[PDB]
Design an enzyme around this catalytic site. Structure first.
Site, PDB file in Angstrom:
ATOM      1  N   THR A 267      49.342  78.418  25.634  1.00  0.00           N
ATOM      2  CA  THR A 267      49.246  76.941  25.608  1.00  0.00           C
ATOM      3  C   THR A 267      48.042  76.444  26.371  1.00  0.00           C
ATOM      4  O   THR A 267      47.209  75.740  25.754  1.00  0.00           O
ATOM      5  CB  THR A 267      50.504  76.283  26.187  1.00  0.00           C
ATOM      6  OG1 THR A 267      50.632  76.729  27.537  1.00  0.00           O
ATOM      7  CG2 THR A 267      51.740  76.636  25.406  1.00  0.00           C
ATOM      8  N   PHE A 392      53.881  67.362  26.027  1.00  0.00           N
ATOM      9  CA  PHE A 392      54.769  68.196  26.865  1.00  0.00           C
ATOM     10  C   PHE A 392      56.243  67.976  26.502  1.00  0.00           C
ATOM     11  O   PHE A 392      57.120  68.313  27.326  1.00  0.00           O
ATOM     12  CB  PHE A 392      54.449  67.931  28.341  1.00  0.00           C
ATOM     13  CG  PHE A 392      53.077  68.374  28.778  1.00  0.00           C
ATOM     14  CD1 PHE A 392      52.770  69.710  28.931  1.00  0.00           C
ATOM     15  CD2 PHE A 392      52.091  67.441  29.017  1.00  0.00           C
ATOM     16  CE1 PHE A 392      51.488  70.120  29.287  1.00  0.00           C
ATOM     17  CE2 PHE A 392      50.826  67.837  29.426  1.00  0.00           C
ATOM     18  CZ  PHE A 392      50.520  69.175  29.561  1.00  0.00           C
ATOM     19  N   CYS A 399      58.304  70.068  29.203  1.00  0.00           N
ATOM     20  CA  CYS A 399      57.614  71.241  29.793  1.00  0.00           C
ATOM     21  C   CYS A 399      57.753  71.261  31.318  1.00  0.00           C
ATOM     22  O   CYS A 399      57.219  70.367  31.983  1.00  0.00           O
ATOM     23  CB  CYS A 399      56.138  71.195  29.445  1.00  0.00           C
ATOM     24  SG  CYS A 399      55.263  72.670  29.973  1.00  0.00           S
TER      25      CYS A 399
HETATM   26  C1  HEM Z   1      51.639  78.064  32.438  1.00  0.00           C
HETATM   27  C2  HEM Z   1      51.834  76.947  31.760  1.00  0.00           C
HETATM   28  C3  HEM Z   1      53.147  76.560  31.240  1.00  0.00           C
HETATM   29  C4  HEM Z   1      54.418  77.005  31.547  1.00  0.00           C
HETATM   30  C5  HEM Z   1      54.809  77.974  32.625  1.00  0.00           C
HETATM   31  C6  HEM Z   1      55.318  76.304  30.620  1.00  0.00           C
HETATM   32  C7  HEM Z   1      56.699  76.486  30.624  1.00  0.00           C
HETATM   33  C8  HEM Z   1      57.583  75.779  29.800  1.00  0.00           C
HETATM   34  C9  HEM Z   1      58.992  75.925  29.805  1.00  0.00           C
HETATM   35  C10 HEM Z   1      59.801  76.831  30.682  1.00  0.00           C
HETATM   36  C11 HEM Z   1      59.504  75.061  28.869  1.00  0.00           C
HETATM   37  C12 HEM Z   1      60.983  74.812  28.590  1.00  0.00           C
HETATM   38  C13 HEM Z   1      61.491  73.730  29.570  1.00  0.00           C
HETATM   39  C14 HEM Z   1      62.973  73.437  29.406  1.00  0.00           C
HETATM   40  O1  HEM Z   1      63.417  73.169  28.277  1.00  0.00           O
HETATM   41  O2  HEM Z   1      63.765  73.512  30.391  1.00  0.00           O
HETATM   42  C15 HEM Z   1      58.404  74.400  28.273  1.00  0.00           C
HETATM   43  C16 HEM Z   1      58.544  73.452  27.273  1.00  0.00           C
HETATM   44  C17 HEM Z   1      57.445  72.885  26.660  1.00  0.00           C
HETATM   45  N1  HEM Z   1      56.157  73.128  26.950  1.00  0.00           N
HETATM   46 FE1  HEM Z   1      55.381  74.238  28.346  1.00  0.00          FE
HETATM   47  N2  HEM Z   1      54.614  75.497  29.811  1.00  0.00           N
HETATM   48  C18 HEM Z   1      53.310  75.583  30.110  1.00  0.00           C
HETATM   49  C19 HEM Z   1      52.242  74.929  29.503  1.00  0.00           C
HETATM   50  C20 HEM Z   1      52.327  74.052  28.440  1.00  0.00           C
HETATM   51  C21 HEM Z   1      51.262  73.372  27.837  1.00  0.00           C
HETATM   52  C22 HEM Z   1      49.810  73.489  28.234  1.00  0.00           C
HETATM   53  C23 HEM Z   1      51.813  72.620  26.819  1.00  0.00           C
HETATM   54  C24 HEM Z   1      51.129  71.747  25.830  1.00  0.00           C
HETATM   55  C25 HEM Z   1      49.829  71.684  25.693  1.00  0.00           C
HETATM   56  C26 HEM Z   1      53.196  72.852  26.796  1.00  0.00           C
HETATM   57  C27 HEM Z   1      54.077  72.211  25.955  1.00  0.00           C
HETATM   58  C28 HEM Z   1      55.471  72.325  26.076  1.00  0.00           C
HETATM   59  C29 HEM Z   1      56.334  71.603  25.166  1.00  0.00           C
HETATM   60  C30 HEM Z   1      55.898  70.680  24.037  1.00  0.00           C
HETATM   61  C31 HEM Z   1      57.590  71.923  25.540  1.00  0.00           C
HETATM   62  C32 HEM Z   1      58.902  71.437  24.912  1.00  0.00           C
HETATM   63  C33 HEM Z   1      59.409  72.394  23.846  1.00  0.00           C
HETATM   64  C34 HEM Z   1      60.597  71.989  23.026  1.00  0.00           C
HETATM   65  O3  HEM Z   1      61.075  70.812  23.118  1.00  0.00           O
HETATM   66  O4  HEM Z   1      61.047  72.866  22.200  1.00  0.00           O
HETATM   67  N3  HEM Z   1      53.489  73.724  27.781  1.00  0.00           N
HETATM   68  N4  HEM Z   1      57.233  74.860  28.866  1.00  0.00           N
END
Ligand code: HEM
Ligand SMILES: O=C(O)[C@H](Cc1ccccc1)NC(=O)[C@@H]1CCCCN1C(=O)CCC1CCCC1
Length: 454
Positions: A267, A392, A399
């Site tokens: 990501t 996010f 996220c």
């Molecule tokens: C090291 C960087 C990152 C980590 C460790 C991370 C970790 C996570 C985790 C654990 C979730 C699930 C949260 C939950 O439902 O309790 C999540 C969801 C999400 N993350 Fe990240 N994330 C990172 C970077 C990013 C970036 C850069 C983006 C977008 C550019 C992104 C977009 C999202 C989105 C859209 C969701 C929601 C997914 C859904 O509704 O199915 N993430 N992230």
């Protein structure tokens, strides 16, 4: 109450062959351009609805009405990410337990503790580019992926992938990338039981074993040493959920670590690659961001407080997320019977897909010029209507990594703009490769050092 448009069908396969493409997000965006704010999508045994307007997505983001759904993609990723945060249902005990334990590890305050480690990897990137010869170029998403993988490895579990020392990936990443590829490839398959896919199935089970065996070992090794290093692994081994009073078990810790390594690889590197893409295509904007980096980053090593001062760099990153949200979809289900937008009646259990790139192109929100790269759209956070900007995701299932991703990306982009001038020497034509995430494939630049010491 209106009847919903639906794209072209393929007899008994309904809309499924529309995903028979290596660019399915880009295909769904075109269909939304042709059909508008909502369309029905059917496969054998499956219906979903694709949402593109702020008007409808603001209703979908009402947590009293809709909860996170595991899309078919997330269900296939759950074969190796398990009941980690990203692939667990809201009602699973391990979701809220891990969420309570980890939230403090991911807060803006916790970024002060990760800063030194992020600077270690960032300085390796700058040193790499400083050391290139005049005839060579930069493979942008390749280098950004080296950086973001290494940062999560070192902040996640004090492990050095040493990606800047290698052309060939770590064994863990070979299996992770190939498992992610198989999960995405299985979406489009009409006849997944056909013996042509036996080898894919065998290889998938082997890749799950590799990831499980290597992460299980990192966890067992940490427990044995008693070492209290300030990383996510220590927080997860020492943390207790204040609700249940329980810690995570070793199996769930392994799923969290695999989940963070997916995110760290997929990501943040896409965001950095698109940001640099837009800057070289918009040299007036690159000069504004380069002026801020030079004025703010006055020390050889950026401080936490200096990164917080890079406002315009933060606006560039938000405008890159607007145009190409690198995690471009999430899914919801209706908690109860409900009517979407006074027009579309849903039964309890009905699913929705949010097409984030289309949301972020809603002219009723952003104005006519939605294709232009204009960081000034984000000069003032509070002027952005609620649920207009969702790179996010939403609510309690948003996220957890958002502050981490934005701190890393702001630090890195700030240092890149301090240390180098950039040339789009090939006049690169944007080609977006889709995995779990979006990245600009084949994006290359030349960097000319400003010869500023570290
Ligand atoms: C090291 C960087 C990152 C980590 C460790 C991370 C970790 C996570 C985790 C654990 C979730 C699930 C949260 C939950 O439902 O309790 C999540 C969801 C999400 N993350 Fe990240 N994330 C990172 C970077 C990013 C970036 C850069 C983006 C977008 C550019 C992104 C977009 C999202 C989105 C859209 C969701 C929601 C997914 C859904 O509704 O199915 N993430 N992230
Ligand atoms: O996975 C699903 O259930 C549906 C695709 C689908 C629809 C109907 C039948 C079968 C598959 N997925 C999607 O629409 C999106 C957009 C196209 C690529 C796959 N999709 C995804 O969500 C992939 C999961 C990613 C995790 C972080 C960002 C998104």
């Amino acid at each position: 109450i209106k009847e919903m448009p639906q794209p072209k069908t393929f007899g008994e396969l309904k809309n499924l062959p529309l995903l028979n493409t290596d660019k399915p997000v880009q295909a769904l965006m075109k269909i939304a351009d042709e059909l508008g704010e909502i369309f029905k999508f059917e496969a054998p045994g499956r219906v979903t609805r694709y949402l593109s307007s702020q008007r409808l997505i603001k209703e979908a983001c009402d947590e009293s009405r809709f909860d996170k759904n595991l899309s078919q993609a997330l269900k296939f990723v759950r074969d190796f990410a398990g009941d980690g945060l990203f692939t667990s249902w809201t009602h699973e005990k391990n979701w809220k337990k891990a969420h309570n334990i980890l939230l403090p590890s991911f807060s803006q305050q916790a970024m002060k503790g990760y800063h030194a480690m992020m600077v270690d990897i960032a300085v390796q990137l700058v040193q790499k580019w400083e050391r290139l010869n005049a005839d060579e170029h930069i493979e942008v998403p390749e280098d950004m992926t080296r950086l973001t993988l290494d940062t999560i490895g070192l902040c996640g579990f004090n492990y050095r992938f040493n990606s800047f020392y290698r052309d060939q990936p770590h064994p863990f990443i070979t299996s992770m990338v190939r498992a992610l590829d198989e999960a995405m490839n299985k979406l489009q398959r009409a006849n997944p039981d056909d013996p042509a896919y036996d080898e894919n199935k065998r290889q998938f089970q082997e890749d799950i074993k590799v990831m499980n065996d290597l992460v299980d070992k990192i966890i067992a090794d940490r427990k044995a040493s008693g070492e209290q290093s300030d990383d996510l692994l220590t927080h997860m081994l020492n943390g207790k959920d204040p609700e249940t009073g329980e810690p995570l078990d070793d199996e769930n810790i392994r799923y969290q670590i695999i989940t963070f390594l997916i995110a760290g690889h997929e990501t943040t590197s896409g965001l950095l690659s698109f940001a640099l893409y837009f800057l070289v295509k918009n040299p007036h904007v690159l000069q504004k961001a380069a002026e801020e980096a030079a004025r703010v980053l006055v020390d050889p090593v950026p401080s936490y407080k200096q990164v917080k001062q890079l406002k315009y760099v933060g606006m560039v990153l938000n405008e890159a997320l607007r145009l190409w949200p690198t995690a471009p979809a999430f899914s919801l289900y209706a908690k109860e019977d409900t009517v979407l937008g006074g027009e579309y009646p849903l039964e309890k259990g009905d699913e929705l897909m949010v097409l984030i790139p289309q949301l972020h192109r809603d002219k009723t929100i952003w104005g006519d010029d939605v294709e232009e790269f204009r960081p000034e759209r984000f000069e003032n956070p509070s002027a952005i209507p609620q649920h207009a900007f969702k790179p996010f995701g939403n609510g309690q299932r948003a996220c957890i990594g958002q502050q981490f991703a934005l701190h890393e990306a702001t630090l890195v982009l700030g240092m890149m703009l301090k240390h180098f001038d950039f040339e789009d020497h090939t006049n690169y034509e944007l080609d977006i490769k889709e995995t779990l995430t979006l990245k600009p494939e084949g994006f290359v630049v030349k960097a000319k050092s400003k010869k500023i010491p570290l």
